[PDB]
Amino acid sequence: DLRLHLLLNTSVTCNDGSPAGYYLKESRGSRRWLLFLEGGWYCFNRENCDSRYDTMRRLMSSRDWPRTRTGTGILSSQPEENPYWWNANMVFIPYCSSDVWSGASSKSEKNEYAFMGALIIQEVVRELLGRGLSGAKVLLLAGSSAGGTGVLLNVDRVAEQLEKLGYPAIQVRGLADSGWFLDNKQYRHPTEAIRRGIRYWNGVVPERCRRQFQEGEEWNCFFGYKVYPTLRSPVFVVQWLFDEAQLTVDNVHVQEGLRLYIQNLGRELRHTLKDVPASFAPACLSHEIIIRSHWTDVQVKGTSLPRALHCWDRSLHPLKGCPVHLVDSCPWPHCNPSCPT
Numbered sequence: 001d002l003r004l005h006l007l008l009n010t011s012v013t014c015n016d017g018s019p020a021g022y023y024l025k026e027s028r029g030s031r032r033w034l035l036f037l038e039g040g041w042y043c044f045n046r047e048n049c050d051s052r053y054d055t056m057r058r059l060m061s062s063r064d065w066p067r068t069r070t071g072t073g074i075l076s077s078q079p080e081e082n083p084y085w086w087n088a089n090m091v092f093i094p095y096c097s098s099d100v101w102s103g104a105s106s107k108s109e110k111n112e113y114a115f116m117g118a119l120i121i122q123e124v125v126r127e128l129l130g131r132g133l134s135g136a137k138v139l140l141l142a143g144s145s146a147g148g149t150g151v152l153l154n155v156d157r158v159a160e161q162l163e164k165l166g167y168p169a170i171q172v173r174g175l176a177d178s179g180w181f182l183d184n185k186q187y188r189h190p191t192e193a194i195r196r197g198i199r200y201w202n203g204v205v206p207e208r209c210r211r212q213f214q215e216g217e218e219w220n221c222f223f224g225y226k227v228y229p230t231l232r233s234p235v236f237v238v239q240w241l242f243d244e245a246q247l248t249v250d251n252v253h254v255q256e257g258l259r260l261y262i263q264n265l266g267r268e269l270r271h272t273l274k275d276v277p278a279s280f281a282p283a284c285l286s287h288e289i290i291i292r293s294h295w296t297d298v299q300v301k302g303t304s305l306p307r308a309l310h311c312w313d314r315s316l317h318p319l320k321g322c323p324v325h326l327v328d329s330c331p332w333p334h335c336n337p338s339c340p341t
């Protein structure tokens with residue numbers, strides 16, 4: 001089990017001003033550290049954040065968090081469940097800021113809620129340095145859904161933080177699961193929600209991407225295919241070709257018009273990954289993968305995700321029989337037989 005620690009700096013808070021935190025299981029024989037960002041949508045104004053506080057309160061407050069959590073999938077310490085990194089130091093960071101991990105604003109006389117996602121990540125890193133992270137060789141910042149987008153927005157800032165604190169030997173990398181979206185045409189009649197959220201949250205984006213798009217256009221940096229080329233840290237992208245959250249935003253819930261729409265979406269997703277050399281993109285209708293207990297079961301071209309990640313590790317020391325770029329070419333959901341049921 002992973003054990004809860006609330007942040008010693010109690011000014012870095014969840015939405016309601018309660019302290020943020022992290023769950024930790026140390027592995028003293030290992031120099032690998034895995035820091036996982038939880039997902040769970042977001043809120044973007046007073047009225048919809050109040051609604052979230054009523055029925056999704058664990059995503060806005062630490063007051064009701066349990067003392068422990070069980071690590072699953074890539075967070076499991078059992079080699080049978082996690083062939084990739086079972087001996088690593090494991091960290092699960094709960095999502096309690098509702099800001100896609102981008103916020104840097106405190107509660108105040110003008111602000112009913114605090115949106116501190118970007119500061120929460122930085123404070124977790126700083127406090128872990130006193131608990132063994134100072135000896136790491138590799139820090140993998142991973143995340144699913146809003147947490148996958150969170151990796152893209154924060155991985156280079158973690159790398160810059162460790163350099164400035166005097167730890168240039170730690171190699172920072174990212175693993176972004178189910179956070180690679182397209183700003184496409186909907187099937188029936190959403191970027192406005194991110195534009196509004198950034199202002200409400202005092203949201204921050206990576207500096208090189210910010211300098212490209214400029215004031216008022218920072219929402220562009222929330223889209224993987226636009227922010228990825230600006231990043232310097234190595235990032236492995238995991239994305240279903242027919243992601244259910246993508247389809248929900250597109251108003252898809254089969255005749256010719258919908259058939260063409262769905263096939264075009266898979267082709268467009270595949271196009272955006274052509275120049276992403278570490279990627280895993282199966283032709284399945286689903287959402288999230290890395291913390292599911294049966295994450296080992298899916299394969300692309302005969303290679304599982306745990307294998308592809310191991311081959312990525314080797315490449316950062318092409319490899320014979322050890323591929324890292326794995327994108328399905330078949331054009332319809334479940335054309336890959338290994339898709340989840």
Ligand SMILES: CC(C)COC[C@H](CN(Cc1ccccc1)c1ccccc1)N1CCCC1
Pocket residue numbers: 040041042100145146149179181182183184190191193194222223245246249
């Ligand atoms: C997992 C969540 C963070 C996903 O949020 C999806 C979008 C926000 N977009 C905008 C978007 C526009 C077009 C197509 C897809 C998404 C978004 C964009 C990039 C990264 C995160 C969220 N919302 C709009 C209303 C409801 C959800």
Ligand SMILES: *[C@@H]1O[C@H](CO)[C@@H](O)[C@H](O)[C@H]1NC(C)=O
Pocket residue numbers: 009011012119
């Ligand atoms: C606590 O965090 C806040 C916000 O990140 C920061 O301004 C402050 O310096 C921190 N306090 C200490 C003692 O580091």
